[PDB]
Symmetry: C6
């Protein structure tokens, strides 16, 4: 909804947004949204996501598709009216994104999703990119393990000419929605096929905000499907735009740069990553 | 409405237009339109705004959606006819923009919205743009607070990979509508996802006049995403075209340039802003 | 309808076309067509113009929309059949443009509209253009007053981020119809939001002929919103095409070139305008 | 239909095609097709031409629009079946072009339409073009008179910002069809607006063959709506393609070059034209 | 049908393919397909070809249109099923191309169509192209006669501004169909208007295999219309792709180069043609 | 479905993926999946593939089209629901690709298909490419035989101007289904007419994963029909994207590079092929 600020309450927000990244316990926002989600009544819509054609499918708190749902209105703090209605398997009325308030007054945050190797990582969408083919898949899985910590991470597979990979977009969003509803660390390998359809364009528009709001992290591979000259800057600008954090390869082998947005209007942080391969191409990220 | 002029009546119009920026009381046009709006008969449609489809949703004075409206007609001074009709939650007959006359004969103005640090600021649309990653968000919020003055400014958030950010265009225009109906100073962060659907084209075309007519100011953020080089003045001309004012960053860190259209056929004024950051990235615009 | 000529009738025609610009009293064609229009039996459709979708709407001589009109036909001298039928507020049968004969055997004329500064001005479409942001709005009004003479000039406002400006194209066409139906001298500010719908393409293509047929002049400004550089000539060839006259700025402040088409296959005349600003941006074109 | 040839009958065709241009009496093919046309039974379709949307309207030998026509089949010499059926004002079944055989065995000709100043001119489509604005309108009307000889020529007017000019495409094809049905020399001023819609594209595809088959000449103005550099070669190649003859302006004032296709696989002829202006811009083409 | 090979059966296929161009009797594959076609049961659909829409019209052995056909099914050697169904004059079920098996196991051939001047020519599609205005029409007719030999060649005429030239795409494909069903040597003049609708794309994609399967040759004319410079090998690669043979003009007046695909995976042969004109532009290709 | 991992399960997976290429018996994955397929209760849908329009068609294990299939669901270990429903010969509910589980927990594999010349070859999609017209068709067949081993290889033919080649895309997809359903080694000649429908885009996107899932190899040739120059790398990045393996020619006659993806995130292996021609263009790849 819309918010109102004066000098004093704006400073409080920025302090709150600062705290959501810098001082909160890693992963506490996810735990908090898990709570909001499970306090939602049986069969109530929680999430709508655009399919290939541009229609939206709707999910409940158990990641189950909502087939039919009688029109229902909710009056926000703002006067704002949210209408949800699902018919014939598709949202007749409503908006894409979370259909329940997960964030409240606390908007424009990059909730800290994890802490690893001395750095805090934001939730939201993290694009792993950089110059042509040199180890994007191994790095996302190593980030997934690292940011997973005590928890297993979720792996969503799409559009690679390898065994067991889904290539149907509608199955992809079903995967993604389930991943965001039930896990804090998600890996997408890869967005290559999404880059266009109205649902594909909707995905790049929504995934970052959905994740950030849930307090989960989505780490997605992005090979620039263009040349050796430039377009590591112009596909990277359909990235840096829709991304909460960017992870890019450097001139030095094994080395990556992380660029994080720490929240609305806050300073971007940059830090450096060293990695190396073990057996069966399993990549390790170095800590100390 | 079309209007007719000779030398004499045209000269009076221009004086009226000049006064509306230069000598009128800051924020007085807003107060006046507030009176026009509340004295309007109960149930009257007052504002129509394009949704993604290009269809138009319709609001009353309290920013409530108008679901069904029996065809009413109004005869203007020209002898021209204004027709509004709303059905199944969508305008069946009418035009985009205000449905009730706020301006009468007094058109082509940039009514003064606010005074600050020795400068008068225009109502209408204010695009904040320039060379990338350079502090657009902190600036729109500082200008928001500053021009709000005694009043809290409204914040419309859209299209960003942060928590609580709506990404559904149709919710966005519902936010826009509510803001202009109910507040003099409004902040949109950001226009990034609007820049194309028919609704997005309609928003760009309309908002500036909607705001100027109301006598409210809409301060919108805009990063050019196409290049780091020369598309700081080709997407910026999709700006200066649809903008009542432009605020662009300069060579000097912290410095911004304001370019103001002061009215129809009138001179464009320019002045500079000096800024610095406090804690939690809260920006201040310097005075005297 | 098609016309036939040998050497002799062709020579009479050109002579008559020549006369319609050079020797005919200024404004006389307008008066004549005002005669034909008012002596039409009310109810009759007189003008059809395309809306945004591409369908047409039909007006009578008092610039009222025609909702329903029972099929009627007229046989031309040609042996060709003219047909008009209106249903549900849209033209079921017919052509865009004038629906009653205002001219006669007399086609391909630029009927002299006004006389000022020792120069005759053509009716039809006048595009005011040239290098970026440099005095267009002031000039169209200065010109509008000067050609107005003893008469007030009509101002149609469209798509500017200023107060009271309609930004809905459907309303725009309605303003144009009424203006051409009721006034010899018309100003459009601005042609920018139209420059493309099927309706916007239609307006570009029809307005000139409509105006020249009526004997009124439409004075419209065209800011070349593309580049500083070489697209001062390629959107100006979107002008040079559908303009009866061009009014283009020079490299000398306050100075303008006027390019006039004096009629079908006749010579193009050029002359210069000197202007200066008074109080509140009111521009004067210098005379004697 | 399809034709079969061996060496001997192919040589006979070429001799016949040669004769249709070089030795036949000017205008005799037109007279011949006039005959075929008037031997057609009452209300039988003779000509179908594409409208704006791409549907086709149908005409009879009197240039009257055929509204309803019961399905009818004709068996050609070839085995080929022609089906014509008109419903609701539009051709339900059939093809664009002539719906009756005007040419027979004698195909691929440029029938001599006229003789003037010692040169033979072909029927078909003649595009008058060349570098930017210098006298295309006066030349088409002078060609019209010249090739008209003893006969008046027909003038079809379209899309110029001058008085009495039709700008509706559907009226344009109605004009054109009537012109080709009832006259040997036609002038179109101008195709500028047609250059795109499916009916516009159909026109450029069909007009040449329709005319050539009728033995009438269509002389159409074509201002290259592009630049001063080139595109007097690339708009000229949407010309030289669909044209039977081309008439182009040279470096020398008043001078034009005529390039004629004399028939299928026959040699192109080039000759030169000198012209000068008299009073009221009436152009004369010099003979001796 | 899919086919299966090992080393041995593949080697036999290639020998079979080699023979089909090099040692088979010229024109013998055509005679064979003529037998397959007439021994087909009465009323059987044999050929389906795309009309402008992309829909397909259907013919029987005598090139009669098939209006209505009860769903029939045929089980192939693979176990694959071929289904034909025709309704309201359009194929409701089936594929484009031949509907009856002309080739069996013998596929990937360029069956020898004709012998002339010491060279064997391939059936399939032959595009005649190269540097503009250079004698494409006289050449396709000379090659037509030459390769016809004892037999008359068929001429399909399309898209030219000459008398008797069909311009309706749907008639064109009816001509194409009749030609291939009924004659070994076919001449199309010209492909100019096909080069895009779905039908035009279908024609380009299909005709080459249709012709090669039948064992007929289609000699089509093609002037590149986009440029005088380098698009003699970028529209020519929309040629060499869809062509079984290429005939291109050279530096030397009268000289042409023939580039022949002799079969699947086989070598491309090249040889040159010398030509000169007789009377009425009748061209002769030189022998010995 | 989504999979979960910690460090330990991830390491087991990569090990298993490694095994599926390096140590597993060649062809063993195919045999397994042939097991799963035949042990499916007939009537069951096993494969859905998109036709030209974008809708999908569904096959059973004997590569027969499924016309009607009553709604059935399956619950995954994930908790996600799989659903298949076929109506009127098209898939009403479900995804493109395999409709029964052929893999297991085992995803992201390039299952070793064959062994030849001291090198293992991956199942999935193999694109044969490189500079213009230079031995592609011979190579795909040479490769097809070599990987065939004791088995015959399947040849799908499409869109070449040669005898017996299907050029209808709908038939093409049908050939592919049957081939993948019944054979370990498949050849496509050619991928040219597909390189775009919604179906052609779908085939590009799904074939690789289909093949790798099945354990068969599809060997397809891609002539870069664009340029001689720099588009040997941008349509090759339409290859590098959806290819399991690449086989690209060098500047040395008869020599080829093989680039293999050995599985998800694993190393890419490169090796060289020497070939030579025998009688009738039959190519051999050299061994020991
Ligand atoms: N042990 C290793 N040593 C060096 N490079 C490796 C190793 N394992 C994998 N790689 C590289 O990492 C990449 C694996 O990820 P993949 O998805 O195939 O490509 P990418 O993710 O870079 O687009 C390959 O490019 C491969 O060359
Ligand atoms: N205290 C600070 N010191 C320096 N730079 C800052 C500070 N706070 C914010 N910024 C910069 O201002 C921008 C914050 O706004 P953001 O939305 O991230 O980008 P944009 O400039 O596109 O609005 C960032 O580019 C960030 O680096
Ligand atoms: N007194 C003045 N002296 C010089 N220029 C002026 C004066 N008043 C207005 N202008 C100019 O006239 C223009 C106002 O017209 P506007 O509609 O903003 O742009 P356009 O030139 O496109 O019409 C501005 O460019 C402004 O600089
Ligand atoms: N008497 C004349 N002397 C010189 N030029 C003339 C004369 N009359 C007309 N013209 C020129 O011929 C043209 C008239 O035709 P028009 O339709 O206006 O342009 P065009 O046909 O060249 O596109 C004008 O460009 C005009 O300058
Ligand atoms: N006897 C001849 N001598 C020289 N050139 C000729 C002769 N006959 C025809 N031509 C040329 O051959 C061509 C005839 O074919 P046409 O369809 O006009 O052009 P295209 O070369 O595009 O097929 C023309 O370019 C013409 O100049
Ligand atoms: N004996 C041979 N020696 C050399 N090249 C050959 C031989 N036989 C065939 N070729 C080549 O193989 C190719 C045949 O394959 P084709 O399908 O025509 O083209 P592509 O290279 O696109 O597959 C031709 O380029 C031809 O030059
Ligand atoms: Mg990857
Ligand atoms: Mg910002
Ligand atoms: Mg202006
Ligand atoms: Mg002209
Ligand atoms: Mg030709
Ligand atoms: Mg090949």
């Amino acid at each position: 909804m819309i918010h109102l600020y004066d000098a004093k309450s704006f400073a409080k927000l920025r302090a709150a947004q600062y705290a959501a990244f810098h001082t909160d316990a890693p992963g506490s926002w996810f735990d908090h949204t898990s709570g909001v989600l499970e306090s939602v009544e049986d069969g109530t819509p929680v999430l709508a996501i655009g399919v290939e054609s541009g229609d939206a499918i709707v999910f409940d708190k158990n990641a189950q598709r909502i087939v039919a749902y009688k029109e229902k209105s909710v009056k926000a703090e703002d006067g704002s009216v949210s209408v949800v209605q699902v018919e014939n398997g598709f949202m007749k009325q409503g908006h894409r994104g979370w259909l329940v308030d997960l964030t409240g007054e606390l908007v424009g945050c990059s909730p800290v999703v994890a802490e690893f190797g001395g750095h805090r990582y934001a939730s939201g969408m993290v694009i792993v990119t950089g110059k042509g083919n040199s180890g994007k898949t191994p790095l996302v899985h190593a980030l997934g393990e690292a940011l997973g910590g005590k928890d297993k991470y979720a792996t969503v597979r799409f559009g690679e000419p390898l065994s067991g990979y889904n290539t149907d977009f509608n199955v992809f969003v079903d995967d993604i929605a389930r991943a965001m509803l039930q896990h804090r660390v998600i890996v997408i390998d890869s967005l290559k096929n999404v880059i266009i359809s109205r649902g594909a364009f909707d995905l790049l528009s929504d995934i970052g905000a959905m994740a950030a709001s849930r307090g989960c992290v989505v780490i997605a591979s992005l090979n620039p499907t263009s040349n050796d000259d430039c377009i590591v800057e112009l596909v990277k600008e359909a990235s840096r735009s829709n991304s909460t954090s960017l992870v890019i390869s450097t001139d030095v082998d094994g080395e990556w740069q992380v660029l994080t947005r720490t929240g609305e209007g806050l300073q971007r942080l940059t830090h450096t990553l060293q990695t190396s391969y073990g057996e069966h191409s399993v990549l390790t990220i170095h800590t100390s």
